[PDB]
Scaffold this active site. Structure first.
Site, PDB file in Angstrom:
ATOM      1  N   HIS B  41      -9.050  -3.461   0.493  1.00  0.00           N
ATOM      2  CA  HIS B  41      -8.432  -3.284  -0.819  1.00  0.00           C
ATOM      3  C   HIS B  41      -7.633  -4.501  -1.268  1.00  0.00           C
ATOM      4  CE1 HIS B  41      -4.213  -2.669   0.363  1.00  0.00           C
ATOM      5  NE2 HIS B  41      -4.618  -1.862   1.325  1.00  0.00           N
ATOM      6  N   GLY B 143       3.335  -4.279   1.181  1.00  0.00           N
ATOM      7  CA  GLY B 143       2.993  -5.518   1.834  1.00  0.00           C
ATOM      8  C   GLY B 143       2.745  -5.392   3.316  1.00  0.00           C
ATOM      9  N   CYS B 145       0.330  -3.533   4.661  1.00  0.00           N
ATOM     10  CA  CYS B 145      -1.064  -3.287   5.008  1.00  0.00           C
ATOM     11  C   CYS B 145      -1.628  -4.440   5.822  1.00  0.00           C
ATOM     12  CB  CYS B 145      -1.912  -3.049   3.767  1.00  0.00           C
ATOM     13  SG  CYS B 145      -1.471  -1.482   3.048  1.00  0.00           S
TER      14      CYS B 145
HETATM   15  C1  SO0 Z   1      -0.499  -1.871   1.573  1.00  0.00           C
HETATM   16  O1  SO0 Z   1       0.466  -2.920   1.777  1.00  0.00           O
HETATM   17  C2  SO0 Z   1       0.159  -0.594   1.035  1.00  0.00           C
HETATM   18  C3  SO0 Z   1       1.107   0.024   2.082  1.00  0.00           C
HETATM   19  C4  SO0 Z   1       1.876   1.210   1.497  1.00  0.00           C
HETATM   20  C5  SO0 Z   1       2.887   0.813   0.418  1.00  0.00           C
HETATM   21  C6  SO0 Z   1       4.076   1.753   0.639  1.00  0.00           C
HETATM   22  N1  SO0 Z   1       3.916   2.243   2.001  1.00  0.00           N
HETATM   23  C7  SO0 Z   1       2.728   1.921   2.514  1.00  0.00           C
HETATM   24  O2  SO0 Z   1       2.345   2.161   3.646  1.00  0.00           O
HETATM   25  N2  SO0 Z   1      -0.908   0.343   0.704  1.00  0.00           N
HETATM   26  C8  SO0 Z   1      -1.018   0.862  -0.511  1.00  0.00           C
HETATM   27  O3  SO0 Z   1      -0.255   0.590  -1.427  1.00  0.00           O
HETATM   28  C9  SO0 Z   1      -2.142   1.830  -0.723  1.00  0.00           C
HETATM   29  C10 SO0 Z   1      -3.197   1.195  -1.611  1.00  0.00           C
HETATM   30  C11 SO0 Z   1      -4.391   0.784  -0.778  1.00  0.00           C
HETATM   31  C12 SO0 Z   1      -5.230   2.052  -0.623  1.00  0.00           C
HETATM   32  C13 SO0 Z   1      -4.791   3.006  -1.736  1.00  0.00           C
HETATM   33  C14 SO0 Z   1      -3.679   2.306  -2.507  1.00  0.00           C
HETATM   34  C15 SO0 Z   1      -2.505   3.243  -2.686  1.00  0.00           C
HETATM   35  N3  SO0 Z   1      -1.716   3.014  -1.473  1.00  0.00           N
HETATM   36  C16 SO0 Z   1      -0.700   3.776  -1.067  1.00  0.00           C
HETATM   37  O4  SO0 Z   1      -0.109   3.626  -0.005  1.00  0.00           O
HETATM   38  C17 SO0 Z   1      -0.324   4.858  -2.046  1.00  0.00           C
HETATM   39  O5  SO0 Z   1       0.827   5.590  -1.619  1.00  0.00           O
HETATM   40  C18 SO0 Z   1       2.168   5.283  -1.747  1.00  0.00           C
HETATM   41  C19 SO0 Z   1       3.023   6.310  -1.339  1.00  0.00           C
HETATM   42  C20 SO0 Z   1       4.391   6.168  -1.401  1.00  0.00           C
HETATM   43  C21 SO0 Z   1       4.950   4.987  -1.881  1.00  0.00           C
HETATM   44 CL1  SO0 Z   1       6.745   4.792  -1.971  1.00  0.00          CL
HETATM   45  C22 SO0 Z   1       4.121   3.956  -2.291  1.00  0.00           C
HETATM   46  C23 SO0 Z   1       2.739   4.091  -2.223  1.00  0.00           C
HETATM   47 CL2  SO0 Z   1       1.864   2.637  -2.797  1.00  0.00          CL
END
Ligand code: SO0
Ligand code: SO0
Lengths: 306, 306
Positions: B41, B143, B145
Site C-alpha cells: 500500500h 508511519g 507500517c
Molecule cells: C501504516 O503506517 C499504517 C499504520 C496504522 C496507522 C495508525 N496505526 C497503525 O497501525 N497503516 C494504515 O494507515 C492502514 C492503511 C494501509 C491499509 C489500509 C489503510 C488504512 N490503515 C489503517 O490502519 C486504518 O486504521 C486506522 C485505525 C485507527 C487510527 Cl488512529 C488510524 C488508522 Cl489509519
C-alpha cells in the site's frame, strides 16, 4: 494506537557485551573503547563471598587470570583496577562497535531497558523501573551479572545500571556504571533485604493519561481535588507524595487530553478507594506505575533513535 | 528469578530496517540481501485506499519512483514486483548486515518480538502474541507500517509478521513475509473488524507454572480434574479447548514443578470461577495468556542467541 511496555532497541548495547571468566566464575562484561567493565565479585571464590575483601583479593590477581571472550575472539587484559564495586579491565583492543555513550545515574521512579545476558551473549530485552526502594523487579538467573540497563537518547546510550545480585524477595540490586550501588546493598552474602516500597504516583497518572489517549475513559469523572487533599489519600494507600514539579511534568499530557492534572488525581483517588470493579485499564487490572511521563509521550508520539 | 515480558535482542533486525518513500507515503522496509520488502500500500494515494487495484497501480510505477533510504545512504531500486500484499524492491546493493534468516508463518497462540520503526529508524521493541482471531495487540502509530515481528533461534532470525494496519478496536493486523494476511483482513479501507477472540488456555497454564517456579503458590490446591471436565469450564469462560498435545507440551514444566498438568487445570478452574480475591500472580491481577510454554522454559532457564 496501543500501549505496550517497550524497551529501546538493543543493538548498540549487544555489540558491547563480552564474557569475563576468572577462576570458576563466569559473568558478563561491558566493552567500551579499550575497557571492559564488570562486577568486582568475579574475583571471588564461593568462600570469599562470606566477608570478602576485594582490595586484598585484587592485589593477588594477575592480568592473565582474566579471560575475556568477545564472541569467539579472546582479548588480552593489559591492566586492571577496581572502581567501587566494578572492575575495569584494560584490554589491548578498542571495541570498534563502541557507540557514543554516557554513564548516568538514575532516580527511583525512572525507567530503563535491560539487556539480559549469559556468557556474554544477549538473551532478551525488557523494561524496568528503579523502585523507590532502589531495587528493580527484573528477570535474572545465575550468570546474568554484568548485564546492563540503559536508555537511548537519539544516537547516545546512557548506561545506568549493572546487575550484581538478587535479594530474598526475588528483586534485584546493582550499581551504576561507576560501581556505586543503588540503595543500601553490598556485594556480599549477608541477610540484607529490600525494605519497604511505595507506588510511583506520578507514573500512575502518566499511565492514566496514556489510557485516555488510547480510548479508556471509564475512570474519568467531573470531580476534582486539591493537591493537598490528594496527597492525604496517597499517603493512606502507600503512594508517593505528588509534588508541584510532578504536576508540571504532567502538563503536556494534560494539555493533549484536556484533562487537568488535579482532575486526573480525583480519578486516581476514586480508583484507590473503590478499586476497578472488574474493569481493566490498558489491559491491566492493577494501577501500573512503571511508565514515566516521558515513556508515555514517547510511545504515544513515536520518537526514534538512529 | 523473576518473570518479565521479554523480547529478543533486536540488533540483527535493526540492521535490516530501511525507509521506503513513494509519492507522499513513507513507511519501513526490510532489506535482506538485495531485496527490500515493504507493504504494497506504499504505492497508493489517499483516494486509492478506497477500492485500490494494486496490479493496475503497480504497472504505472517506475523503479525511480521508489526512494529507499538505508540510514543516510540511498539505494537504487533496479526492479520491483508484487508478492501478495508485499512489494519486493530489487536494489543494486546486498545488505552486508543480512543475518541468517527464514520466512515462517506462526500459529495463533504463538509469540514474537516486534521492532517498531518510523522512517526506517527503530523506536522500540516488545513482545506480542498472535491472538486466536489473527490480530495482535500492538503499539503502532502512523508511519509504522513495514515494522516486522520475529523470533530468533540461536543465530537465525525467523521473520513472521509485517505490519499493515490498525482495526477499529485498536488492535493490529498484518501479513507474513510472503505477503499473506493473518486472518480475514485486507489492505483496503473497509468496515472490517477483529471478530470474537478467546483466551489462550495452554499459555495461561504455562504462566501459572512460571509463577510456581518463581514462588507464587497460593492458587495451588490438591484438587484435580479430568481433561473433559476442565474443557467444559474453559468453554464457559471463553477459553480455548485444551488438547492432549497441549498437555504433552506442558510436560517439562509439570516435571520441573512436580504439579501434574491436570492439577494445574484444577487450579485454573478455581481461579476462573472464584477470581483472585485481591491477590496477584507474577505482578498481575489478571490471568495472563501471552507467554508460551517455550517462553516460560526459555526465561526460567536462560537460553541465549549469538
Ligand atoms: C501504516 O503506517 C499504517 C499504520 C496504522 C496507522 C495508525 N496505526 C497503525 O497501525 N497503516 C494504515 O494507515 C492502514 C492503511 C494501509 C491499509 C489500509 C489503510 C488504512 N490503515 C489503517 O490502519 C486504518 O486504521 C486506522 C485505525 C485507527 C487510527 Cl488512529 C488510524 C488508522 Cl489509519
Ligand atoms: C551474578 O551472576 C548473580 C546473579 C543472581 C543469581 C540469581 N539471580 C541473580 O540475579 N549474583 C549473585 O549470585 C550474587 C553474588 C554476588 C554478590 C553477592 C553474591 C550473592 N548473590 C546473589 O544474588 C544472592 O542471592 C540469590 C537469591 C536468590 C537465588 Cl535463586 C540465588 C541467589 Cl545467588
Amino acid at each position: 494506537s496501543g500501549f505496550r511496555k517497550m524497551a529501546f532497541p538493543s543493538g548498540k548495547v549487544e555489540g558491547c557485551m563480552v564474557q569475563v571468566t576468572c577462576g570458576t566464575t563466569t559473568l558478563n562484561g561491558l566493552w567500551l573503547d579499550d575497557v571492559v567493565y564488570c562486577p568486582r565479585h568475579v574475583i571471588c571464590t564461593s568462600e570469599d563471598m562470606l566477608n570478602p575483601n576485594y582490595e586484598d583479593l585484587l592485589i593477588r590477581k594477575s592480568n592473565h587470570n582474566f579471560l575475556v571472550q568477545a564472541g569467539n575472539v579472546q582479548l588480552r587484559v593489559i591492566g586492571h583496577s577496581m572502581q567501587n564495586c566494578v572492575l575495569k579491565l584494560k584490554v589491548d583492543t578498542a571495541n570498534p562497535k563502541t557507540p557514543k555513550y554516557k554513564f548516568v545515574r538514575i532516580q527511583p521512579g525512572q525507567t530503563f531497558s535491560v539487556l539480559a545476558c549469559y556468557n556474554g551473549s544477549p538473551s532478551g530485552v525488557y523494561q524496568c523501573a528503579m523502585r523507590p526502594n532502589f531495587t528493580i523487579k527484573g528477570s535474572f538467573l545465575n550468570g546474568s551479572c554484568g548485564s546492563v540497563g540503559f536508555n537511548i537518547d537519539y544516537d547516545c546510550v546512557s548506561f545506568c545500571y549493572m546487575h550484581h545480585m538478587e535479594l530474598p524477595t526475588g528483586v534485584h540490586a546493582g550499581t551504576d556504571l561507576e560501581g556505586n550501588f543503588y540503595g543500601p546493598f553490598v556485594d556480599r552474602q549477608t541477610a540484607q533485604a529490600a525494605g519497604t516500597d511505595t507506588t510511583i504516583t506520578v507514573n500512575v497518572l502518566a499511565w492514566l493519561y496514556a489510557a485516555v489517549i488510547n480510548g479508556d475513559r471509564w475512570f474519568l469523572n467531573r470531580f476534582t481535588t486539591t493537591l493537598n487533599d490528594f496527597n492525604l489519600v496517597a499517603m493512606k494507600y502507600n503512594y508517593e507524595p505528588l509534588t508541584q514539579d510532578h504536576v508540571d511534568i504532567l502538563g503536556p499530557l494534560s494539555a493533549q487530553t484536556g484533562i487537568a492534572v488535579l482532575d486526573m488525581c480525583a480519578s486516581l483517588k476514586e480508583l484507590l478507594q473503590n478499586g476497578m470493579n472488574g474493569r481493566t485499564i490498558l489491559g491491566s487490572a492493577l494501577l501500573e506505575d512503571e511508565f514515566t511521563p516521558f515513556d508515555v509521550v514517547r510511545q504515544c508520539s513515536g520518537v526514534t533513535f538512529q
